[PDB]
Predict the structure of Ribonuclease pancreatic.
Amino acid sequence: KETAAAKFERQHMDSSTSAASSSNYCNQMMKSRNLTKDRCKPVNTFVHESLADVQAVCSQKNVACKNGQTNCYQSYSTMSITDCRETGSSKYPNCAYKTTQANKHIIVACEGNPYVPVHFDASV
């Protein structure tokens, strides 16, 4: 029902905030976006750029995906992102996360027609 493109937007897009709102950000967002529903998803990145900017990465720099597929693309510009990483003390269902804001190139996997982001591979 939920397209892979929609799921990418749900898991990785947050254009409302231009940086990691607060120390609470990840705790709130991993829950709100249903990334703590079944397990504590252990790491996850949010992007604070427009959807059009992130989508445009699919026509940017073609690089190898971590799994060895060829459909990953690195942004020529740095982007505002927040990484969310599970604390050691985190215990499902109360998933707890460190919020780290950064500005880095993002790497996304794209697929489909139209050719859109479906996975967040890495940032560099």
Summary: The domain at 1-124 is CATH 3.10.130.10 (P-30 Protein). The chain has one domain: 1-124. The chain is about 20% helix and 35% strand. The beta strands are 43-47, 61-63, 72-74, 79-86, 97-104, 106-111, 116-123.
